[PDB]
């Protein structure tokens, strides 16, 4: 029933950010779409 998050902005191995007691089973995740006037082959060639 506890959520745990680790991250790294430098190197590959992650380090502990935080833990959070929820008491409920998480069951889904979703990467939110990002809308932008940039980030495409016809404007800057960048990609998410």
């Amino acid at each position: 029933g506890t959520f745990y998050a680790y991250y790294a902005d430098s190197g590959m191995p992650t380090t502990f950010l935080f833990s959070l007691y929820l008491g409920t089973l998480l069951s889904h995740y979703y990467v939110l779409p990002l809308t932008c006037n940039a980030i495409s082959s016809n404007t800057d060639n960048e990609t998410l």
């Binding site: 029933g1 008491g23 409920t24 089973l25």
Partner: protein, 48 residues
């Protein structure tokens, strides 16, 4: 983790001629599989 939820008698969720204008919900007696008792013994409530 906590209880995922009480089982609902689905034959008590919605209304008999209910169209799409009404939203789905169940009456309070539709939730089953639970019970209660007092915690009181000798004028004190017992706690774990």
């Amino acid at each position: 983790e906590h209880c995922a939820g009480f089982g609902v008698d689905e034959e008590k969720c919605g209304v008999l001629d209910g169209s799409y204008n009404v939203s789905c919900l169940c009456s309070t007696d539709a939730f089953l599989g639970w019970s209660y008792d007092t915690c009181v013994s000798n004028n004190r409530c017992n706690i774990f």
